[PDB]
Amino acid sequence: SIKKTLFVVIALSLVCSIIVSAAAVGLRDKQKENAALDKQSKILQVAGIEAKGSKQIVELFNKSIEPRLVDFNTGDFVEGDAANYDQRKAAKEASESIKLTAEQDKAKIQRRANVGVVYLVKDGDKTSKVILPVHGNGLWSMMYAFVAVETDGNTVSGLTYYEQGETPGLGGEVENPAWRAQWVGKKLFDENHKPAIKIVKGGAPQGSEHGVDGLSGATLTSNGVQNTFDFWLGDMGFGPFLTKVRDG
Amino acid sequence: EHYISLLVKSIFIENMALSFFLGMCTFLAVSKKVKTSFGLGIAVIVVLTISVPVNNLVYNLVLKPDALVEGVDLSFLNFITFIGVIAALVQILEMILDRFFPPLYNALGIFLPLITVNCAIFGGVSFMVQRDYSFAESVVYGFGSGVGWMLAIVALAGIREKMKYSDVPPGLRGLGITFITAGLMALGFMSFSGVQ
Amino acid sequence: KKSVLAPVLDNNPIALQVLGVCSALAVTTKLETAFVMTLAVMFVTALSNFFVSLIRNHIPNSVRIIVQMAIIASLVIVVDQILKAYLYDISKQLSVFVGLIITNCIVMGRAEAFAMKSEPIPSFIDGIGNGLGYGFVLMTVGFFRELLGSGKLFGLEVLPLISNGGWYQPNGLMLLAPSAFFLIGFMIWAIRTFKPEQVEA
Amino acid sequence: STIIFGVVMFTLIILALVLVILFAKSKLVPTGDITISINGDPEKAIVTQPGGKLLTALAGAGVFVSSACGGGGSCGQCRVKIKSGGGDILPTELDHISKGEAREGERLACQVAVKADMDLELPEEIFGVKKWECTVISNDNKATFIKELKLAIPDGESVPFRAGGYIQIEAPAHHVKYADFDVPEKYRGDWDKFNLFRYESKVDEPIIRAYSMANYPEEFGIIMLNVRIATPPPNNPNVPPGQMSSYIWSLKAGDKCTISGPFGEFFAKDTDAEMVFIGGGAGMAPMRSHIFDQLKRLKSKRKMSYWYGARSKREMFYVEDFDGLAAENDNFVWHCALSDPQPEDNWTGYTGFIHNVLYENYLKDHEAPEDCEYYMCGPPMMNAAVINMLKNLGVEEENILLDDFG
Amino acid sequence: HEKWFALYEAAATLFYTPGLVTKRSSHVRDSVDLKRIMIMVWLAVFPAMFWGMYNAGGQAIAALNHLYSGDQLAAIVAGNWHYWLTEMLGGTMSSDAGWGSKMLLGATYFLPIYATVFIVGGFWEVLFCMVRKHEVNEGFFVTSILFALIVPPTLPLWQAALGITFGVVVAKEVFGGTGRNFLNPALAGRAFLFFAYPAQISGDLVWTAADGYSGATALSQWAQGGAGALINNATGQTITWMDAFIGNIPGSIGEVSTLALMIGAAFIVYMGIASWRIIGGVMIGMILLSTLFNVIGSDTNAMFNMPWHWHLVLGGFAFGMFFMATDPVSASFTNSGKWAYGILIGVMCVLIRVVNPAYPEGMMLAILFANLFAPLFDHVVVERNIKRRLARYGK
Amino acid sequence: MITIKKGLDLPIAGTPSQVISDGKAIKKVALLGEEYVGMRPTMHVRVGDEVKKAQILFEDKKNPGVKFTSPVSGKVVEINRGAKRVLQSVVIEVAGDDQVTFDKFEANQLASLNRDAIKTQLVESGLWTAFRTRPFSKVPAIDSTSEAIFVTAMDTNPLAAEPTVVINEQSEAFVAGLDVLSALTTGKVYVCKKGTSLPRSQQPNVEEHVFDGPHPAGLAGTHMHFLYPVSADHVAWSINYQDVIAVGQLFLTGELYTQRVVSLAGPVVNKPRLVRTVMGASLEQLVDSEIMPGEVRIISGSVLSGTKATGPHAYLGRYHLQVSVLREGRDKELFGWAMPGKNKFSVTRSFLGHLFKGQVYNMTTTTNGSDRSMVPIGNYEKVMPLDMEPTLLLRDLCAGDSDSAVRLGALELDEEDLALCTFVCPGKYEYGQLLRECLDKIEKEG
Ligand SMILES: Cc1cc2nc3c(=O)[nH]c(=O)nc-3n(C[C@H](O)[C@H](O)[C@H](O)COP(=O)(O)OP(=O)(O)OC[C@H]3O[C@@H](n4cnc5c(N)ncnc54)[C@H](O)[C@@H]3O)c2cc1C
Ligand SMILES: CCCCCCCCCCCCO[C@@H]1O[C@H](CO)[C@@H](O[C@H]2O[C@H](CO)[C@@H](O)[C@H](O)[C@H]2O)[C@H](O)[C@H]1O
Ligand SMILES: Cc1cc2nc3c(=O)[nH]c(=O)nc-3n(C[C@H](O)[C@H](O)[C@H](O)CO)c2cc1C
Ligand SMILES: COC1=C(OC)C(=O)C(C/C=C(/C)CCC=C(C)C)=C(C)C1=O
């Protein structure tokens, strides 16, 4: 009796579809906020702003952060919806992408999106620092971080790795607060405007300007971190944009 | 080429059975005998080779975000479409083989009901969504993943046949010792964890 | 009361039966993912059984498998949306295993075996009990892995780590695949020692 | 907006999926009716639609296959010879069927699903089955927990069977109370000790059971049977009481029950060697038929013996019959061992269990105990204890024909 | 005590051979028993054990006098119980130490680990035998010595106790004990530490017993900068091939000396205890892949240009090939499968060494991986034999 | 023609002189019931009965028509039964010269005799029991036939006799037997020898094949594997050369020929040699005043495949052609498992003894170790010349996987085919017993 089977299939299908299509469509706005607010907390963390609770994170982010788009090649701002921009999608899509050469691919990242998104930390209508999102391949996974550079474009206010799959204890110590705290006060560039931040194996001299202690027993992960700041402070990363920041 | 690096990736570096814990129930249940284990594995290879690329066509053409119409993304229908596609294509396979290819049905078609709505098949497509695969790429991934799944289950069957001489304490005999065997197998398959 | 608690140490889906092992091996690194996953499995198993029972007398036998998976797939899709809207952090951690509840042999195993040819309420209770036993395995494995692999329970420090000025060195194998296999294997051994009726021949 | 698309696409995939499956079914799965051949006879060929187990089609036709468990899969009485079809023997089938038997086509019919054409070679005994509803004549209590059942043949003549056979009795749902049971004052006194009348059997649905015959072939007119009442274990009251035996026990003159024809394989060997009989409880039925069959039907001169196990004199029934046969023919002798004689019994003969009385008296000094056929049937405890003794005497399993009735 | 009587049976069978006679055919038996096999393997690693203790102490002394000196060196010695105990018994710690002082210092690192491995590992072996009512077997003697010889000299004792516990229980005892499992027990225990506590069995802080000293090993150095990066910083000298062959390198206690291992390997190979088909297979696999990488070449990976003879003398390859891949129980049982089983080990070791950046060596992972496929190699071999039988061997 | 390399010659001291001499008079003769595989006796005689030469003593319930007849005439003195009333032996005191006679024939008529005629005479005289079937080493069913009968005209067992010495005397009888076998076989008769010249049958049916190398180059199982592989469908018959002589004597003179030539040898044997005896002769009487003092074990057959001759089982077996006497080694040695054995023999090179080539060893019944699980060091593959995987086959036998054992070639094997595997096993497993258990299951299920 195909007549009865079709009635059941259609009747059951319609009720299931209505609930499924209603739940996903109705909940889409709440889901977008949950993901949108998740990243904002990490930016507020590296920015130096203490935020507790979902409401506070949204309030402080909209009051003291300013997403902005930038072109890596020209090192200048570009117009667009900075808040709503998946830079990873741009890197994947050939639309805004560059297949980096082996020599240039110092951080072992396959592509680099043409437009990059930074986060200006406004303070009384005046920028106080730029949070540059950088990423580079580690030993196991691809590691993403936020680097906070002061207005001068050289001093580093802080660093946080918000996504990495390195081995805990050995390579996952990039998220150790003591290691992160060691970055504040360092300089990304030397007097010659060339990258100088160094991840020194076996530790770094106390009071150094561009030296950061390496990860004990995790050379390969530490090498990846050193590679990450080499590329993203170079000509093909934020070197143009950062140089512009130095001179206003 | 790129495809070759993908195939070796989906057999050793990415292992559904041991690295992703997918298809465990049939993996630990049909591992008693090598011959039957070698049988289910082939059916898994066939189902993955058919299921993954077909769901790839549907996803890109229909379920892909914003592809069908501007501002309309039917992504929430992902789970129902993949499972529905796999279930339908397996059942028809059990029918065409039985009617037209008796020997193949008794060799590979018998295991298809086990491969229906199996975790390994669904998990393979699920990763193929969180990863962007071209149709040719999806074919290799589907083929390679099933081949690697066959390697683990066939390897387990060899160990269990060798275990006929084992004297396993009661209470561990059967399921309990099999779980330990799989864990020890997982230890040896972590030798390519760092490979690319 | 006895019926609901039966699938815990008498016909447990993972200890006696081999069902829902894929989740028990992949989301037991933390109790938060193990706890939320088990609640989902109870929500789906109980509800999928309930709906299957109501339309059992009219389901077409030719495509009953499709009709059943549609109910489970619809419910799991709804659960996925809820976890995204709330508990997005946990939802991200579970990754593709929220959708793999559809193929979870526990959900289908009860649906075909019990939800069919049974009354709705008993079939609903059948799902509730099965998830409880399924949850018991996920809690025991999840408890030992999180405690020894990270020194924390539910994210709370219980063993101060030497890195965090503590005294306990975490065990890195507890966060990897083999540990889950060993814990379940030894978990079965303990159960069948206090319940020797479950010993295989 | 998007919900409309979600609803439409959701159904279109399901409708497309089911339509492909349903469309594929018509052009791939053969729905034509199956033809089953029994023994190759054109008339006996059974035509049944695809689906269901083998026993289903056969039961409807004129060929009845014995099934003690009624398709439960753990009885082995559904063994049939499948010349063609039926696929390969299932792994569960090998549990009750040896590997050698598998090569001969011995398959469990209830475990075999009819999904295509097949050929069957059912034996004559399975073919020769007739449904009869005899009218119960006598339901007297032979002992404390044993009754002698007399059956009136409906269409005259007598049931055709060999000595030691059984008839599969089926009864409908009924509520029979132990109070309705009628017992003589001699045995009723012992019943009052525990007062089993408080039990009330409630047979919710019809059941099928087997009962060994208690009449040799020449005993035309009455199919004598011996029935033991089934009761919950004394130490485990949480068990349902007798269902079929209780129903049969509740019956009296006038009542009728179906017998579904005779069956059995408990048949003696046609040789010239000594025979040994060890009956217990309901096991006295085959022994009476076998003893009657040999003494008069065959007039065999072979030496015979009988060792019935009983606890008290009131348990011992048919004593007069054995005494007459023993006196009538010297070749046949019988002895009984009292496990626990009553104070009033004042027994002065063999005492204890037969598993030691038999050995210490006859087998121990027997020149060639192996050169004997041991037909045994009794309580499970008797069978287990006796088996160990016989093995310790070097007795081949082929010479031990156990017919445990439970 | 009934339970302790079983243990006394093992002790009596150890000092005195049993007086048992055959109860059926064969009425005469071969002289070899499992006991003699185990002690021959146990004695075969004695040359490597003694050199290892000498090497470990030598490396530690050279690094200590290269980092500290005078009062600082004295304070370092007083801080560590390993150091002054060597001086307490009559061993110098300066740069003029003799072989006795170097050996004595190494003994303070090996003996505690071996004793910890033996006592903790032996407890599990006895517990399983007592509860399950079995006689203790001699397999543990080989397992305990091999496990202690493949760990860094600095390994914490509590980690050593855990490693032997995992190997003995999880890999061998739950399967029924000696002869009834499929995985190499000593390497299973090592893999447990490898993944459980990677910080203590990898890096540049564990392969030399000098406090405060950081030094990479030869395999690590080559992976960084090729053959030219092989340098002993505690002595400032280049690591020559003959240095690795003799064993004047940092590393596991018993692995360093390829020469010492070969001498022991030759004896058990000659005695028939160690399969030469497996050892031959390992060499074939390692050589074929090493030369294949050499021909293919690579401008980014220095491991591509390591020749076969350098693969032989570095890391744990020689120790694994002679004493671990030859474990009869976890290897293949057919002659043909032994060649394949060895080849898979040799290929896998080179693969992990050159392609898996996460780990500089792969002998332990290679053998464990190969153990999983030894039953399959036998399966393919027997099925071929079964086909020959069903054709009446062409007769 | 067929050379074997994977095998082991045990260099046990006391090899026989290889010269036939008259033996000690034998007064007790028996038939061993437990050495016929799958035999359930039906007694045709009670204690005190008088028996003729070839009179039946008992029949087989599970092999109808097979008669086990007396080797001598006299009185039955005891019917020994062991556990579960298993027939151990039927002892007959020798007395008189009465014999059951049979039809005789001329030498030229034997090859043309009818198959049923040959069968009837052999079964009636009891000589049918000389044959054993591969698989299962059972007496062939009377109504059965084989296309391949193997004649073992060689013996590579340690301390064995030289068949050439025995056969040369009975040249006419040995050839007459081959002609009888020529007519009895549906196919060929395979005569397996060591390359030295033997009397040769002139029938094209009888083929001679030479086997060279160590034991088991002389075992019938080895010969079948190389010349006529056996399975469930192909069954071969084996008969030793001395029984072939009896076959020829029976059909030439019409009298049962029960004289046997056995090697009495061993380390504790004063003057090892070949001695004339009778079938089932008492071994206690045969070795009296011939063994050195001490606690010794008398074995019927070889030290590899033989029966301990004590009590009920103290008589010569039907299929045994030698008696070996050794010391019972009960001496516990301090650290003996660790000493360098100049006087210890092994298939491995882990003892000093293997360096002294040509050395002989005073082997005892010592196990040389305790029972342990199998650790396979390749010892099995050194002594097993058949196309098999002994380690996997033996592990199946240890595990009881009868189905697996059949696929690996268990149906081709007898207990004696696994004696060397038992000898070299480090774990001290007894594989002959395990094989018999597996073969019993396969026959019971079939
Ligand atoms: C070939 C054959 C021949 C037989 N011949 C005889 C014969 O001659 N005489 C004879 O008396 N019996 C005979 N039996 C035994 C017969 O099958 C029954 O056991 C007997 O007739 C009692 O029937 P019952 O179902 O009422 O008791 P059963 O239920 O079969 O007895 C089992 C025990 O459990 C109790 N019980 C009752 N219902 C249930 C239930 N639903 N679940 C669990 N326990 C229950 C019973 O009271 C009893 O104590 C024969 C059996 C076979 C197979
Ligand atoms: C008993 C032990 C085993 C005996 C083995 C018999 C010898 C085996 C020889 C293998 C083949 C020759 O092996 C040869 O080794 C030399 C070292 O001198 C390598 O020498 C060099 O070659 C490559 C290019 O080819 C260079 O980039 C690299 O610096 C180095 O590897 C060769 O690449 C390799 O081809
Ligand atoms: C040649 C040889 C090598 C062995 N190698 C090892 C080994 O590497 N690791 C180990 O734990 N045991 C080893 N053993 C001991 C034992 O055989 C092994 O633990 C088995 O796995 C126990 O069944 C060896 C034994 C022999 C004879
Ligand atoms: C015969 O060889 C062996 C021994 O010699 C008698 C042992 O002693 C042990 C065990 C050794 C120790 C120290 C265990 C300590 C703990 C308990 C409970 C006894 C083992 C495994 C062994 O193989």
Ligand code: FES
């Ligand atoms: S839950 Fe059973 S296969 Fe995944």
Ligand code: FES
């Ligand atoms: S009817 Fe009982 S097993 Fe088939």
Ligand code: NA
């Ligand atoms: Na070295």
Ligand code: NA
């Ligand atoms: Na590497």
